[PDB]
């Protein structure tokens, strides 16, 4: 079912169905690392975690990080036999493409080379960005994990005016649910579940099945498998508590929740799988 209200600018069922049909064009494979026998699932987590730190340093949006994550996973599904030293180049080039797509004033190319501490030249990044975009058939507009959370938070706080395009919801609980998703995205097994299911399951853990279904459209049976998998990650966040909303220099406070943050999530990811 569709959780969107009536839309003045289109058939609500049409918009939602385009969004749903989008997730059929955009395939993911939780086992794509079997195409690269020399890689481990932990290397992906360390790379993604590094990209998250890079985003916070340059105050890049959460959407930019998750585009880079999605570009990375989908590009790997098209490739074979990749080694450790090529990972930092593929990641940072994914982030380069992502920043150019999403930021009003993205960082320059040499800054993306600068953060690799010289392991990636600007010319290497430009070569890699073309390889990535060509191998992805220039399909560079997925509905990221975090984009679904954005939808779910609007619907949860829909007034009677039913205005769905002007953002309105507490920034504090948004960044708390994003924190659970940032952890789960480090585990490659998350790709078993569609991005919209992943975001709805994180929201459920911070509220209820009734709110989850109201704002996501999915029934409890659709997300039960995801929720049971997210179980260890959710409790790790609960044991340590949730983070506070930050202020960023030069960032309007009504956009402050949209900036990617970084925390020591790798040790918390290790405090699971048991």
């Amino acid at each position: 079912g569709s959780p969107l209200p009536v839309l003045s600018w289109a058939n609500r069922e049409e918009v939602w169905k385009i969004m749903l049909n989008k997730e059929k064009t955009y395939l993911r494979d939780q086992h794509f690392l079997e195409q690269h026998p020399l890689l481990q699932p932990k290397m992906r987590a360390i790379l993604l975690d590094w990209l998250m730190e890079v985003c916070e340093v340059y105050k890049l949006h959460r959407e930019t990080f998750y585009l880079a994550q999605d570009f990375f996973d989908r590009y790997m599904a098209t490739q074979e036999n990749v080694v450790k030293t090529l990972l930092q180049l593929i990641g940072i080039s994914s982030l380069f493409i992502a920043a150019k797509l999403e930021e009003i004033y993205p960082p320059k190319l040499h800054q993306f080379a600068y953060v690799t501490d010289g392991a990636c030249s600007g010319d290497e990044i430009l070569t890699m960005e073309l390889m990535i975009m060509k191998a992805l058939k220039w399909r560079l507009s997925p509905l990221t994990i975090v984009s679904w959370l954005n939808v779910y938070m609007q619907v949860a706080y829909l007034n009677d005016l039913h205005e769905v395009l002007l953002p309105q919801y507490p920034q504090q609980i948004f960044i708390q649910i994003a924190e659970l998703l940032d952890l789960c995205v480090l585990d490659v097994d998350c790709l078993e579940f569609p991005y919209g299911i992943l975001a709805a399951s994180a929201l459920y853990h911070f509220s209820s099945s009734e709110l989850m279904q109201k704002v996501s459209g999915y029934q409890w049976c659709d997300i039960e498998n995801c929720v049971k998998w997210m179980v260890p990650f959710a409790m790790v966040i609960r044991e340590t508590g949730s983070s506070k909303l930050k202020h960023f220099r030069g960032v309007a406070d009504e956009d402050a929740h949209n900036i990617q943050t970084h925390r020591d999530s790798l040790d918390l990811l290790d405090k699971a799988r048991a």
């Binding site: 969107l4 003045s8 600018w9 289109a10 058939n11 049409e14 918009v15 385009i18 969004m19 989008k22 064009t25 959407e63 380069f96 493409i97 150019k100 797509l101 009003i104 993205p106 320059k108 190319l109 990044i125 430009l126 960005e129 073309l130 975009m133 060509k134 058939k137 220039w138 399909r139 560079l140 507009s141 984009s147 954005n150 939808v151 609007q154 205005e163 769905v164 395009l165 002007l166 953002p167 309105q168 309007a252 009504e254 956009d255 949209n258």
Partner: protein
């Protein structure tokens, strides 16, 4: 890149040049947007990455098709469907005789169909002007040049300010609104609608303040009743002169009653009240061009 023979240069922008080309085997003509990557310090331009990814998911009869993306010799070739004229030159060629009213209606109907498709796919065009609307020899008109376009989220966040060419720029942009979405494209289309009718630009300003005052002199100086929140906008001033709204029988003399009504709703000041592309298609101005489909109520 071998079967294509460049035939004529047709355009030039910041990141590339557009050529008409012709396949020597099939006789098929296309438009080539060439991007020399050797000159680009930031790699593939953001505007090119955006346009390609957007158009690969926007397949519609009233949107100029992206056919192929070819990378060769430090260059990037975007291969497009070819159309032989833009609406700007068609309006100038028609300036003495006028575009016939059934053709204005058909062109506007098609433009609203293409815009409605963009908006349902959560894409803003943000640069609708007659030079970006292409026509063929079979009565079709199509949206083109998506280099300034942007996908919007549900809900949106703050996007690039001061978008849209000046004459077609909505008043909420000129007044510095923090958020915007689909209403900016409808305003541009309403400006273009009136321009087809009068063969003159509706609001030909030479600065941001001159543009806003040209709008005010025609549609009246807006206030809180007609546009809630207008007096709280960053570029609003209490010192704006008070002009009275002009009768549309003088703004668009040739337009009949249904046309005047549709134009008024496309030029509503309040972006929340401005008619949507989908609703405009249902307007009685097109009641003869289209018939409604039955609607399930479930």
């Amino acid at each position: 890149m071998e079967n294509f023979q460049k035939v004529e240069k047709i355009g030039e922008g910041t990141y590339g040049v557009v050529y008409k080309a012709r396949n020597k085997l099939t006789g098929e003509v296309v438009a080539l947007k060439k991007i020399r990557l050797d000159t680009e310090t930031e790699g593939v331009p953001s505007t090119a990455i955006r346009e390609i990814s957007l158009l690969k998911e926007l397949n519609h009869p009233n949107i100029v098709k992206l056919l192929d993306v070819i990378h060769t010799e430090n260059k990037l070739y975007l291969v497009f469907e070819f159309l032989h004229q833009d609406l700007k030159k068609f309006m100038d060629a028609s300036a003495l005789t006028g575009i016939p009213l059934p053709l204005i209606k058909s062109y506007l109907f098609q433009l609203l169909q293409g815009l409605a498709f963009c908006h349902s796919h959560r894409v803003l065009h943000r640069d609708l002007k007659p030079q970006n609307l292409l026509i063929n020899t079979e009565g079709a008109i199509k949206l083109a040049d998506f280099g300034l376009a942007r996908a919007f989220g549900v809900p949106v966040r703050t996007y690039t300010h001061e978008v849209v060419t000046l004459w077609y720029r909505a008043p909420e942009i000129l007044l510095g609104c923090k958020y915007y979405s689909t209403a900016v494209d409808i305003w541009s289309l309403g400006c273009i609608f009136a321009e087809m009718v009068t063969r003159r630009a509706l609001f030909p300003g030479d600065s941001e303040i001159d543009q806003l005052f040209r709008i005010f002199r025609t549609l009246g100086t807006p206030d809180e009743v007609v546009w809630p929140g207008v007096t709280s906008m960053p570029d609003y001033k209490p010192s704006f002169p008070k002009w009275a709204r002009q009768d549309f029988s003088k703004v668009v003399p040739p337009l009949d009653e249904d046309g005047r009504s549709l134009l008024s709703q496309m030029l509503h000041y309040d972006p929340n009240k401005r008619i949507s592309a989908k609703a405009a298609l249902a307007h009685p101005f097109f009641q003869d061009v289209t018939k409604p489909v039955p609607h399930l109520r479930l």
